[PDB]
């Protein structure tokens, strides 16, 4: 039942820690019958977020409860609900039992009110899980908030009101796999819980009460509270995760700095300023580029690598041991008997290696010899970073119990500052996912009339198939906040409206092009021609000023653009913005699993490497079926004989190739 | 063998593959040592082993040695869940830098492999004969048409399709003044002045020609090409150019695409002869041309065309600068009138129920029909909205275009996905009245969650179910191969041409596409002079034969067909070519020795995935 | 992809026969030393960095080209195998 803890991000951890499944010992419910259970019961309202469930075989099996809903006594969720007396709503909230819920008519929170009294005689309510459009007097309780409707992870995508659940669940789920970055950024447009997120999630440090800073060292902070006391708290600099990431509370307070009660002290690894900050906000333009935004491929400009803008440290934890074989104890030694001592310089101390060094594939890690026969640890193929730590529990087991035969044990820690590279994968909060396709030299990449170019160009064809307009709404919002140099709080449905969107559009365009004018420059011939063509398509009213029609285009959220390679302006205005995009879990499947020659099984001669060599790839059966479809006679023969089982034949082919 | 993540190879041609070098390194260590001993790179093969065992013993000349070795070499690539014959294909490897695997984007669907994280594997044939056989009948550049059914599996993708549709589209904006230039050249002069003024838009209803064609005349298309180059003329314009012997009144993009066709295959004569330059280019016409060109020139020139098409479509898609915006979701006001119509009718139904005259079933069904009606009402309204109002809607340009989308997607986004069933399967009364341009109501979205959950669950179950069914299929069909001469059995099947019960008693020329699927490339059990053409016995059934015979059946000259069948194939085990017939991934009828049963198992079980 | 694949198709009764013929010719070039060629001297496969493709970067192209020539004659059963191999081995010191 219990297993590893979700140490991807504090939010990932909290979601994992507050989510319930159906399966278990089996008697409660086993795997083969969930169709009826998988559909979201009406009672899930205010009880279960139906978008948080893990998609796949275990879809409808696991979900996080309603964010505001909680167990009263015995695995029975009650949820907040605004009492509504007659035409007067009561701020008092009653956590209702699901069964008791049917007993009343729950009014929605979206209904406008003049305070405790409704603002509409005809208001929808939830009599018993149905839309009942009744008078305000027919509701006993009204929806406390949309927030209570969902789990925590649901509520962190701003513009859910214009996005499909099919990919809403996808986005909410991918929210968990976010790796805390070197640089923590908060979304240009938020939901409002990131503060509460980093509060409940103990990533950052918080000042108990009022006080001042005594000392803030890179690993400690002595605070002195207004109570006349002082207490110091060690600060987590670099701590490995379940997956080998960084763990630091960012020092956020200067020495002699007066911090109040509950004052965030050192923001967690993925908090910007007591705020959820993972991934980064990048200026993005949606346009179908040649082929690097093909289906969900993401095209990136070079600058985000020039800037320290997407990277994390990955932590690797190797380990070996010496045993006392009846053939002879396996000494952990520096000796490679046969040929060379040169590579043994790295293994500085005998058996154990020197610390704080880069490692190449195949480098000795722990020395040892079996029966003497050389049998020692080496650097695993793939990549190793820099030596950071070692542990050496020989027979001298202080409180350790090295297993029988184990003459001694040893642990090794390497670190590799993994920058974002070509194959990495990223996605937005609003669900749309993808993998980086190519980073282009920013020299020729499209650039604004202002030299400032965008960070990422997406393939637009994705959105139409998807059902998610909140993403483009956020595109506009972030584009606005760009010039506005300021953030926003958008409740999922009660938040911003397109009217205010166009207001901010006019404001930001006025800013941008008023300063353009102050530059001594209005419209360029390129702008005039493109504006003429927009008139040709009717996108801009003919006869309106190029200034004014460009302003309307801005309020359209689209504007002109210049190429950079051919430098040309781009026909058709494009919507862009500062989008808060995250890098997903680039799990182990990313690493090459490419072995040519190496080990084989004991009972069978099927190649199998692993620690020494990558290992032979699974060949499967239906693959042979496809081969059957083709006339692949001798190639398949080779596969199953020279590449599958035949040691003698495979080595004979080895030597023939030699 | 190996496996890792992939990345698109837009530069890559399908005849090749995007290969990070550092894997081929370990893979070809044998051949690498072979060559670098073939060079002076290491003293011996084993000194070579030591030289190459370290990333820091790396020599660049290792690189040109490896390239020389692989000059004429290829590998095989495959996706994790393999379901069909092309679940693996042969590519000529290209060593590349970086980690990810570079992939020709076209087959991004041949392999049902998006870019969501899934990583593919690869192996290699080794023996000279093994490599020969792999390159010969496992080459993707060799494996073009679906053998499951004769459809081509290299269908052009959304981006290129959109680019060519945009390039080949034409525009028309306004006509207010004298449109009837047809007869008067005084009319042309006056309307040309009005075009000189604001009176005449370029894409005016010019009776003989819009002002565009009168104003500008081009002998050699490079002319109009330059005019666009000067920014003089847009690519979707009504212009006239004196073609080889014709005053072609076309859009620029149309002639340019024709020219693209001309280079891709040498015989531009046929290139224009086989091209319908008179329509906006759509994926369906795309496949039609792909097929016919493959028929005419074959593999090499057809693929030349395919690659040039990919190139040009990508180019033009980029050039378009076409991007989706929230305002691109054009909500036709006709839709709001239909919506008010539907709401008022629903209120009428509800009020009629209120005093009880309708039964809950009666009122429920009345509401159901009212919305099922208004939904198509608005669909038609929005469609018209597109044809005349916004022919260049990025949203509508795409949906109309074959690249992506459906009417339902647009409605759900532009209009609304109103009608949706309950957890039982019954639709809720109050449909989904909002759109995504609208903000979905909390309870409405909660309700909509149910259908999405059901879709996810049943698709996931159908996955394993289709795996099971295909497993059984291969279990049973595996024995069957074509090994035979003409199975002398004079027993065939007469294939009906009429679906006799569409109405209880309604015998009608059966559906066209179904007829093509059942009868294409068949063997005439006996000669049939149907439409004056003596369709001799055993004569194979070309598509044009399909068309002739569809026309004849419309004439009613025959209702079924004397044609062979495996069912009437005499061959104890196996089927006669005549008993089997024609269909290959290539055109000519099947070759003796082909494991047809496996092909059938795949072709049938694979579709079950989506049922 | 491959030159005159249609032509070779016409000269080849079955696609698989063409495949087998090409592979047999290629392995012939291999085994007896690559000198088992008939159109090598004047026109010939040629590399890019150099003329190395004259030797054997990829034999299959050699077999395809020779097939495009009428120089080779492939019989599904044309000669007794023992004597064919024996005469190949006497008359080819290219080994």
């Amino acid at each position: 039942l219990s297993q590893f803890k979700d140490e991807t991000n504090p939010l990932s951890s909290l979601r994992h820690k507050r989510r319930i499944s159906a399966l278990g010992p089996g008697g409660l419910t086993r795997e083969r019958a969930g169709f009826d259970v998988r559909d979201v019961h009406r009672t899930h309202y205010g009880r279960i977020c139906p978008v948080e469930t893990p998609e796949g075989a275990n879809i409808g099996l696991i979900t996080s409860l309603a964010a505001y809903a909680r167990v009263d006594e015995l695995g029975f969720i009650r949820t907040p609900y605004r009492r509504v007396v007659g035409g007067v709503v009561t701020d008092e909230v009653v956590y209702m039992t699901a069964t008791e819920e049917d007993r009343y008519t729950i009014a929605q929170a979206n209904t406008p009110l003049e305070g405790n009294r409704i603002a509409a005689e005809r208001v929808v309510a939830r009599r018993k899980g149905e839309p009942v459009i009744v008078s305000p007097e027919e509701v006993e309780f009204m929806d406390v908030s949309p927030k209570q409707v969902f789990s925590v992870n649901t509520n962190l995508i701003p513009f859910l009101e214009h996005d499909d659940a099919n990919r809403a669940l996808m986005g909410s789920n991918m929210q968990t796999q976010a790796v805390p970055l070197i640089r923590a950024q908060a979304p240009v447009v938020m939901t409002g819980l990131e503060e509460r997120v980093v509060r409940d999630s103990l990533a950052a440090l918080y000042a108990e009460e009022d006080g001042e800073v005594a000392k803030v060292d890179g690993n400690r902070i002595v605070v002195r509270y207004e109570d006349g006391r002082l207490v110091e708290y060690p600060l987590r600099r670099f701590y490995r995760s379940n997956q080998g990431t960084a763990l630091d509370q960012r020092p956020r307070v200067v020495v002699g700095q007066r911090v109040r009660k509950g004052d965030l002290l050192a923001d967690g690894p993925a908090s910007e300023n007591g705020f959820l900050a993972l991934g980064q906000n990048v200026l993005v333009a949606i346009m179908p580029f040649d082929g690097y935004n093909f289906e969900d491929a993401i095209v990136i400009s070079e600058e985000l690598l020039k800037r320290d803008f997407y990277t994390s440290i990955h932590i690797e934890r190797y380990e070996i041991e010496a045993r006392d074989t009846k053939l002879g104890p396996e000494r952990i030694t520096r000796d490679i008997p046969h040929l060379s001592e040169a590579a043994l310089r790295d293994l500085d101390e005998e058996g154990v290696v020197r610390i704080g060094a880069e490692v190449k594939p195949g480098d000795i890690l722990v020395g040892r010899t079996s029966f003497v026969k050389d049998t020692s640890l080496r650097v695993p193929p793939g990549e190793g970073g820099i030596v950071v730590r070692t542990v050496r529990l020989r027979r001298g087991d202080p409180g350790v119990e090295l297993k029988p035969g184990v003459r001694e044990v040893v642990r090794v820690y390497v670190a590799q500052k993994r920058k974002l590279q070509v194959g990495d994968k990223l996605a937005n909060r609003h669900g749309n996912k993808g993998v980086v396709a190519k980073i282009l030299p920013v020299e020729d990449m499209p650039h604004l009339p202002d030299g400032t170019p965008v960070d990422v160009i997406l393939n637009p064809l994705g959105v139409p198939s998807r059902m998610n307009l909140g993403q483009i709404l956020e595109t506009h919002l972030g584009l606005a906040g760009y010039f506005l140099g300021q953030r926003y709080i958008s409740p999922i449905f009660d938040g911003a409206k397109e009217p205010e969107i166009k207001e901010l559009l006019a404001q930001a365009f006025e800013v941008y092009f008023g300063k353009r004018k102050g530059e001594g420059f209005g419209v360029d011939k390129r702008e005039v021609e493109v504006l003429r063509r927009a008139e040709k398509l009717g996108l801009v009213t003919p006869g309106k000023t190029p200034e004014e029609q460009l302003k309307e285009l801005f309020l359209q959220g689209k504007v002109v653009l210049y190429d950079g390679r051919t430098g040309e302006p781009i026909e058709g205005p494009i919507v862009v913005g500062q989008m808060f995009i995250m890098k997903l879990y680039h799990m182990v499947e990313d690493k090459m699993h490419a072995r040519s020659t190496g080990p084989y099984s004991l009972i069978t001669q099927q190649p199998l490497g692993g620690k020494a060599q990558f290992g032979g790839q699974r060949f499967g059966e239906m693959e042979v079926w496809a081969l059957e479809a083709y006339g692949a006679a001798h190639t398949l023969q080779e596969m199953l004989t020279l590449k599958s089982d035949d040691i003698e034949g495979r080595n004979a082919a080895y030597e023939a190739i030699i | 063998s190996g496996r890792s993540v992939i990345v698109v190879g837009p530069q890559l041609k399908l005849h090749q593959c995007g290969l990070p070098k550092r894997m081929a390194l370990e893979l070809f260590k044998p051949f690498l040592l072979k060559k670098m001993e073939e060079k002076g790179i290491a003293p011996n093969v084993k000194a070579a082993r030591r030289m190459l065992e370290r990333q820091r013993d790396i020599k660049d000349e290792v690189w040109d040695a490896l390239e020389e070795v692989i000059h004429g070499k290829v590998v095989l690539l495959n996706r994790a869940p393999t379901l069909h014959r092309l679940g693996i294909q042969a590519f000529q490897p290209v060593l590349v830098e970086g980690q990810s695997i570079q992939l020709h984007p076209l087959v991004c669907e041949a392999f049902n492999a998006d870019f969501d994280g899934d990583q593919m594997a690869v192996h290699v044939p080794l023996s000279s004969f093994a490599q020969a056989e792999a390159r010969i009948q496992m080459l993707s550049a060799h494996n073009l048409l679906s053998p499951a059914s004769g459809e081509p599996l290299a269908k052009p993708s959304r981006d290129i399709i959109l680019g060519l549709y945009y390039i080949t589209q034409v525009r028309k904006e306004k006509k207010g003044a004298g449109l009837e230039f047809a007869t008067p050249e005084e009319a042309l002069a006056a309307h040309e002045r009005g075009e000189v003024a604001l009176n005449a838009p370029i894409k005016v209803a010019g009776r003989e020609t819009s002002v565009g064609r009168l104003k500008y005349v081009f002998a050699n298309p490079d002319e109009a090409l330059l005019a666009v180059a000067h920014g003089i003329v847009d690519l979707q314009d009504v212009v006239t150019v004196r073609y080889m012997g014709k005053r072609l009144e076309t859009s620029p993009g149309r002639i340019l695409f024709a020219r693209i066709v001309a280079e891709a295959v040498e015989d531009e004569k046929v290139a224009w002869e086989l091209i319908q330059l008179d329509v906006p280019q759509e994926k369906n016409s795309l496949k039609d041309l792909v097929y016919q060109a493959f028929l005419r020139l074959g593999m090499e020139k057809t693929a030349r065309l395919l690659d040039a098409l990919k190139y040009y479509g990508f180019t033009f898609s980029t050039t378009s600068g076409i991007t989706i915006g929230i305002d691109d979701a054009v909500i036709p006001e006709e839709k709001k009138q239909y919506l008010e119509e539907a709401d008022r009718k629903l209120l009428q139904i509800e009020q009629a129920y209120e005093m009880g005259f309708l039964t809950d079933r009666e009122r429920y069904d009345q509401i159901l029909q009212l919305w099922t009606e208004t939904t198509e009402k608005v669909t038609q309204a929005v469609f018209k909205n597109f044809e005349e109002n916004y022919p260049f809607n990025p949203l509508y340009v795409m949906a109309q275009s074959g690249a992506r989308g459906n009417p339902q997607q647009i409605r759900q986004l532009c209009g609304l996905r109103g009608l949706m069933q309950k957890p039982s399967g019954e639709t809720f009364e109050v449909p989904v009245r909002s759109s995504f341009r609208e903000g979905l109501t909390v309870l409405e979205y909660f309700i909509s969650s149910h259908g999405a959950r059901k879709g996810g669950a049943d698709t996931a179950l159908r996955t394993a179910d289709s795996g099971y069914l295909t497993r059984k299929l291969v279990d049973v069909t595996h024995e069957i191969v074509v090994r035979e001469a003409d199975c002398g059995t004079t027993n065939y099947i007469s294939v009906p041409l009429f679906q006799p019960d569409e109405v209880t008693r309604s015998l009608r020329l059966r559906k066209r596409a179904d007829i093509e699927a059942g009868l294409y490339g068949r063997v005439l059990a006996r000669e049939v002079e149907v439409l004056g053409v003596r369709l001799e016995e055993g004569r194979y059934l070309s598509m044009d034969d399909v068309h002739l015979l569809i026309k004849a059946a419309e004439a009613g000259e025959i209702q079924e067909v004397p044609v062979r069948s495996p069912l009437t194939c005499q061959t104890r085990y196996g089927v006669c070519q005549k008993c089997y017939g024609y269909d290959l991934s290539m055109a000519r009828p099947v070759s003796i020795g082909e494991a047809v049963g496996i092909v059938a198992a795949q072709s049938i079980g694979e579709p079950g995935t989506q049922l | 992809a491959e030159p005159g694949i249609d032509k070779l198709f016409g000269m080849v009764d079955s696609k698989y026969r063409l495949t087998v013929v090409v592979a047999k010719r290629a392995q012939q070039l291999l085994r007896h030393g690559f000198k088992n060629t008939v159109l090598e001297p004047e026109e010939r496969p040629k590399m890019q960095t150099l003329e190395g493709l004259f030797d054997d970067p990829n034999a299959v192209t050699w077999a395809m080209k020779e097939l495009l020539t009428g120089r080779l004659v492939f019989g599904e059963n044309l000669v007794p195998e023992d004597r064919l191999q024996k005469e190949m081995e006497r008359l080819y010191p290219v080994e």
Binding site: - | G593 | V73, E76, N77, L84, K86, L91
Partner: peptide, 29 residues
């Protein structure tokens, strides 16, 4: 696997002449 195609010896006219002299070798005395 088709026997009709699976083996098809490829031969040059020089090979044909070689087999010709191999046949001619059968003359005794």
């Amino acid at each position: 696997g088709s026997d009709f195609v699976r083996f098809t010896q490829v031969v040059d006219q020089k090979t044909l002449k070689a087999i010709e002299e191999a046949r001619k070798e059968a003359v005794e005395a």
